[PDB]
């Protein structure tokens, strides 16, 4: 739906940085193992492309989705060749669409 576009979920299922880029805000706070780097859309897309190449994705399960006013989130588990990662995406309404402004990715147990 509007708050969590199906395409965001499909992008993660496919390990597609190019699909994901469609839903990114002008700046995205990427958090890998707790280190935050707030970068522009192009650099965020490149960082996700590297992440998806290093850790080849076989699937993505959505665990939770939600909304609070003009903010939304989706939390899921990404299965990869190097194990599972929890993905936490935070979106906010910009004009008439919800765009990703933070992606936190943490390596988790199987």
């859309």: which residue's tokens?
A: 41
Q: What is the dihedral of CA 77, 61, 8, 109, to 10 degrees?
A: 0
Q: How far is CA 45 from CA 41, 66, 99, in A?
A: 6, 24, 13
Find, among 48, 57, 50, the residue nearest to 102 by Cα. 48
CA dihedral 13, 54, 35, 38 (to 10 degrees): -70
Cα–Cα distance for residue pair 102/61, rounded to 1 Å:
19
Per the entry, the structure determination technique was: X-ray
Which tokens in the block code for residue 59?
Answer: 């699937």
Q: What is the spatial distance between Cα 92 and Cα 4, in angstroms, rounded to a whole number? A: 10
Measure the CA–CA gap between 27 and 15, rounded to whole angstroms.
Answer: 20
Resolution of this deposited model, Å: 1.4
Alpha-carbon distances, residue 110 vs 77, 78, 97 (angstroms): 10, 11, 34
How many domains are there within the chain? Answer: 1
Range of the domain at 34: 1-110
Rg over CA atoms, the chain: 13
Q: In this structure, what CATH number is given to the domain that contains residue 75? A: 3.10.450.50
For residue 37, what are its two tokens? 């780097």
């Amino acid at each position: 739906g509007q708050e969590i576009p199906a395409g965001v979920i499909t992008a993660f299922k496919r390990g597609s940085s190019q699909e994901l880029s469609k839903y990114m805000g002008d700046k995205v706070n990427l958090v890998f193992q707790g280190r935050s780097t707030n970068v522009d859309k192009q650099k965020a897309t490149a960082a996700m492309q590297e992440f998806f190449t290093k850790n080849k994705v076989s699937g993505f399960n959505v665990n939770h989705q939600g909304k609070r006013d003009e903010s939304s989130f989706v939390i899921g588990t990404l299965a990869t060749t190097n194990g599972n990662f929890r993905v936490n995406c935070f979106l906010k309404k910009v004009q008439n669409q919800y765009l990703i402004h933070q992606i936190r990715i943490d390596k988790i147990n199987e």
